[PDB]
Write a protein that binds this ligand. Structure first.
Ligand SMILES: NC(=O)c1ccc[n+]([C@@H]2O[C@H](COP(=O)([O-])OP(=O)(O)OC[C@H]3O[C@@H](n4cnc5c(N)ncnc54)[C@H](OP(=O)(O)O)[C@@H]3O)[C@@H](O)[C@H]2O)c1
Ligand SMILES: COc1cc(CN)cc(Cl)c1OCC(=O)NC(C)(C)C
Length: 316
């Protein structure tokens, strides 16, 4: 149930999403990550931004301590936040994430976003109009610093997140490149299926990793509540009835059959256990074509706070 990355490491194809909004106690991330591991999740997706690495790391260490898993069975991801793109900040950021999680290494470290933010101030510096304050950083220098983190053994693999094709090409074409990104973790679901970006990633042996694969958490900070609710989609519902599964399981299975590694966040015990059933059935070619027909260029994250950033990826 893993894919081989372009650096020889292996990534489980179903990952557990650990972000929950501030109104959810930090406490819960511990409980639910333990449940996820218990249910069979072996890929766990976190980030500095999520303010949960202590909890997620403790859950991992607890399941190691009680003999449920070994460290080598777990694939743990963190992400470099955008105020730390300047190359001298990259390794310290990673070391901080490792200290929070109390792990010797991460399996994967990502550049969280191509949108660099002003360093040395707040987590997300914003101007008087609520627009994030940009910084101009050559991301090929950020990437070089990421490569050094791999060479040091702090991260087994390195990749990117929220890059568009041109932004990936900038890294892939860098003189002296040592390591390609193993993946590009992007918003991806039947309303925004990223087929052309997926084709490009496949052509370069870069794994596309889907977030908001179940339609996002529809956070009021970033998501229009008028947007269609993915898990209420009539085609997904019809397919769920056909297969006697659920719309969520259809949406996850869709990604696996296109060669996309898929994340799924749930803080609910029943749904956490349900999501692992993605391995238990399959969709036909006609089912897949029906789901492909849902594409409508819908990125749920759609905010003024990001859309003017000079490296906003959806500009392309
Ligand atoms: N790289 C990035 O910039 C980026 C951006 C966004 C997200 N991510 C990562 O991707 C992960 C997942 O994306 P996401 O947070 O947008 O959420 P998601 O995976 O799209 O899930 C959306 C909602 O689906 C519900 N759900 C889960 N399983 C279900 C089921 N079987 N039936 C019905 N509902 C179900 C969950 O609610 P309950 O909790 O109530 O079950 C969850 O709030 C994040 O946690 C994070 O790790 C990365
Ligand atoms: C959802 O994305 C962001 C969240 C915060 C948190 N305050 C800050 C910034 Cl700069 C964010 O934008 C980064 C980013 O790549 N956003 C995309 C995914 C393009 C919508």
């Amino acid at each position: 149930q893993c894919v081989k990355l372009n650096d020889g490491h292996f990534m489980p194809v179903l990952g557990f999403g650990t972000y929950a909004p501030p109104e959810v106690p930090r406490s819960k991330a511990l409980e639910v990550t333990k449940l996820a591991i218990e249910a069979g999740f072996r890929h766990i997706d976190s980030a500095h931004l999520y303010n949960n690495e202590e909890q997620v790391g403790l859950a991992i260490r607890s399941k190691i301590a009680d003999g449920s898993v070994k460290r080598e069975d777990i694939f743990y991801t963190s992400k470099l936040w955008s105020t730390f793109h300047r190359p001298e900040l990259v390794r310290p950021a990673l070391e901080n994430s490792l200290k929070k999680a109390q792990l010797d290494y991460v399996d994967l470290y990502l550049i969280h976003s191509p949108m660099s933010l002003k360093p040395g101030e707040e987590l997300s510096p914003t101007d008087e109009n609520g627009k994030v304050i940009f910084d101009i950083v050559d991301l090929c220098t950020t990437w070089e610093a990421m490569e050094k983190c791999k060479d040091a053994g702090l991260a087994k693999s390195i990749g990117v997140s929220n890059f568009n094709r041109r932004q990936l090409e900038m890294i892939l074409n860098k003189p002296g490149l040592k390591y390609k990104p193993v993946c590009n973790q992007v918003e991806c679901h039947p309303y925004f299926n990223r087929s052309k970006l997926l084709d490009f990633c496949k052509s370069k042996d870069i794994v596309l990793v889907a977030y908001s694969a179940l339609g996002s958490q529809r956070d009021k900070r970033w998501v229009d509540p008028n947007s269609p609710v993915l898990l209420e989609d009539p085609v997904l519902c019809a397919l769920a009835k056909k297969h006697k599964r659920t719309p969520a399981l259809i949406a996850l299975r869709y990604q696996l059959q296109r060669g996309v590694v898929v994340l799924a966040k749930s803080y609910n015990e029943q749904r956490i256990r349900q999501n692992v059933q993605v391995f238990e059935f399959q969709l036909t070619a006609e089912d897949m074509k029906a789901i492909d027909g849902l594409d409508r260029n819908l990125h749920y994250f759609n905010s003024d706070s990001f859309a003017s950033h000079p490296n906003y990826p959806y500009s392309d």
